[PDB]
Design a protein around this ligand. Structure first.
Ligand SMILES: [Cl-]
Ligand SMILES: [Cl-]
Lengths: 122, 128
């Protein structure tokens, strides 16, 4: 059964990105657009992605369906934070990398909307 | 371990006899006041949904209060609650516990007291 540490070490070897691991074993890295993504695991069971979006953005309806797992836009210290979670069990390297990629793409879109489906389905 | 199998395990525990095919949404009747829909997306994601019946004060919607989180969405100008997790690893005991937490939360959010807006969420946040 793969631990969070093993997973994240394998992932960062794969990605070749500059990153930090704090002394609470939270992984952090930053990419262009001043986007810092944090990955943390609770109780060796739940993996979270998190990013402070740096502004108080328009309140998102926060439905499920647009992303799997969902990307939820919350509010902390008067500013928007985006987060997404899923269980560690069954989480694999290809899933982590794809999840990170779509989470970052979502962040970029939300932080800069003025770039160049109305219906959600089960 | 499929959604069907998990649901049949829930019916066995509830004493129900009902057919729920892989793509079906099941309406879990809690109260003449509460229904929880249970669905599974792409044979992978178990999804809970309930209408809260008011346009509630915006929820800060942070993770941490329940695992998996209960997220307050807005749909047709009213508040909904939802929660999800992956089917892999999920078993009947966790499925029941999850449902109990979700139902408890719904009942609390439908009380007159949380009609009133809450204090702003502020860091540090410690998740023990
Ligand atoms: Cl990446
Ligand atoms: Cl109410």
């Amino acid at each position: 059964q793969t631990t969070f540490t093993e997973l994240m070490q394998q992932l960062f070897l794969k990605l070749g990105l500059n990153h930090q691991v704090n002394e609470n074993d939270v992984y952090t890295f930053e990419v262009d657009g001043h986007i810092q993504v944090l990955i943390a695991c609770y109780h060796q069971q739940w993996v979270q992605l998190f990013s402070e979006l740096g502004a108080d953005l328009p309140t998102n309806d926060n439905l499920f369906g647009e992303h799997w797992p969902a990307h939820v836009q919350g509010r902390l210290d008067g500013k928007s934070i985006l987060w997404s979670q899923q269980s560690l069990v069954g989480l694999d390297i290809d899933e982590m990398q794809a999840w990170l990629e779509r989470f970052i793409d979502d962040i970029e879109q939300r932080k800069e909307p003025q770039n160049t489906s109305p219906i959600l389905f089960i």
